[PDB]
Amino acid sequence: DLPLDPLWEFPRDRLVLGKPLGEGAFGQVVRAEAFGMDPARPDQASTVAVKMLKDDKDLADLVSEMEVMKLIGRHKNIINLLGVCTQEGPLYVIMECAAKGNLREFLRARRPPGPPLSFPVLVSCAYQVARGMQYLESRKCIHRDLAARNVLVTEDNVMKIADFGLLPVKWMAPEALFDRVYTHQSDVWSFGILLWEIFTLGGSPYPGIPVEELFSLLREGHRMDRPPHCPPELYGLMRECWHAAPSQRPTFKQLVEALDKVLLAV
Ligand SMILES: C[C@@H](Oc1ccc2[nH]nc(/C=C/c3cnn(CCO)c3)c2c1)c1c(Cl)cncc1Cl
């Protein structure tokens, strides 16, 4: 329909698509061979991920999303926007591609047998999501879901958060679960569930509990118990992210330091 941004408008010509990546809600995401995304060498080649429509009000959600990534600008620990294609009809959105796709899945594959993923790599995994979440808050942006299935893993073990903006109940915080309100502190709760999702090497939160009286059990103070081999400072950090009072929940800036003071044990 509408205009063309020289800061992001890419020629469809230099972009040969490829095989999908798999979800969902807003649109389909396919691997795609884009040529010359780095204009230093226009003969270069790389593998980027492209977002399209299936066919819709989803054309408004899709554009509303594209506009927002332009706003926040680049960053390391978030999926960065690379370019777009609105010129000749169908809307393509070109962004960074993480080959080890997805976290939650990143862990359940390197999962040892029951009794590679060393401890520091896992602190690296979380400390990156910490830095990415603080950036989103500072740009006045928000990310509600925040599961280990919303964090993508680059080729180099770099964590890039997926999706942001200005049913999955085990991750939601009380005030969002019952009052339907989301603050920066509701994310700090979700990040704690994420911390637990990692040190269990991709487990399911509150294992073996029906999603339904879960609220009553949290209405008692019963948070999940220290995963095995998780050193107490980390479970100590999860309990803080699970404090019922949001004003007693840590800010993301403090989750950066605590995790950085740990990463520095080395
Ligand atoms: C719905 C999908 O959107 C995206 C958005 C940006 C992306 N940049 N790069 C990937 C690569 C995903 C991948 C890489 N390897 N594999 C094989 C897995 O079987 C899948 C990717 C996926 C998704 C997925 Cl597929 C996963 N988690 C979150 C999201 Cl949003």
Side-chain angles (χ1 to χ4, degrees):
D1 176 17
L2 271 187
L4 308 171
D5 191 345
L7 305 145
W8 304 92
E9 186 61 70
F10 199 70
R12 309 158 169 271
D13 324 330
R14 311 190 56 147
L15 178 64
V16 39
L17 311 170
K19 282 194 167 53
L21 294 173
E23 314 156 31
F26 65 100
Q28 188 72 23
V29 175
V30 312
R31 225 190 318 255
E33 196 75 353
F35 281 111
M37 192 61 55
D38 177 27
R41 193 205 318 263
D43 299 339
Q44 248 174 22
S46 73
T47 57
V48 304
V50 167
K51 306 200 150 126
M52 317 148 56
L53 296 164
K54 176 221 168 172
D55 157 57
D56 285 294
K57 293 182 177 178
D58 315 315
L59 172 60
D61 295 4
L62 177 56
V63 164
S64 189
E65 174 184 10
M66 170 224 294
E67 307 278 335
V68 168
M69 311 182 65
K70 296 183 181 178
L71 261 179
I72 324 181
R74 213 238 297 177
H75 190 273
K76 192 59 170 187
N77 289 311
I78 73 179
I79 281 288
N80 292 312
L81 184 59
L82 305 179
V84 290
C85 300
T86 33
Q87 58 278 90
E88 305 310 315
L91 173 44
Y92 299 9
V93 169
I94 302 144
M95 339 161 145
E96 288 172 336
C97 183
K100 291 157 148 165
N102 189 297
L103 201 17
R104 157 161 179 80
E105 190 46 62
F106 165 88
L107 299 161
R108 307 173 101 277
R110 302 141 203 267
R111 238 167 174 174
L117 297 188
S118 53
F119 185 66
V121 158
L122 301 181
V123 198
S124 171
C125 288
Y127 177 68
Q128 294 184 39
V129 181
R131 297 184 74 83
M133 281 306 306
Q134 179 193 209
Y135 180 73
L136 298 183
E137 168 179 347
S138 63
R139 300 278 298 164
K140 275 319 199 178
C141 271
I142 208 62
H143 176 55
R144 300 182 178 180
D145 205 347
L146 198 65
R149 60 176 158 273
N150 304 133
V151 177
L152 284 163
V153 185
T154 68
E155 185 46 52
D156 317 289
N157 303 331
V158 189
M159 303 304 132
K160 298 209 173 222
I161 314 263
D163 307 338
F164 19 83
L166 291 174
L167 197 150
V169 188
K170 304 174 173 183
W171 293 255
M172 306 179 46
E175 62 264 73
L177 201 141
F178 185 80
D179 214 355
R180 313 309 148 103
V181 306
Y182 309 77
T183 85
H184 296 323
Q185 315 314 297
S186 71
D187 299 6
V188 182
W189 181 288
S190 300
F191 182 68
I193 315 278
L194 211 163
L195 257 181
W196 193 97
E197 279 209 63
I198 301 178
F199 289 115
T200 59
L201 301 182
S204 281
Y206 310 86
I209 278 75
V211 205
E212 237 72 35
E213 65 303 324
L214 178 272
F215 204 11
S216 166
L217 292 209
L218 308 163
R219 279 172 168 183
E220 303 170 356
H222 287 202
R223 319 293 191 252
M224 301 128 83
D225 311 307
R226 189 167 78 97
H229 316 86
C230 173
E233 168 67 290
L234 298 153
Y235 183 70
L237 286 188
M238 307 176 216
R239 290 308 293 243
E240 300 169 45
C241 304
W242 292 335
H243 277 162
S247 69
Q248 297 167 3
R249 293 188 210 168
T251 59
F252 275 115
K253 320 96 192 74
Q254 297 164 290
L255 297 178
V256 163
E257 314 174 45
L259 295 181
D260 196 48
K261 294 158 74 174
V262 170
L263 161 82
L264 179 47
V266 298

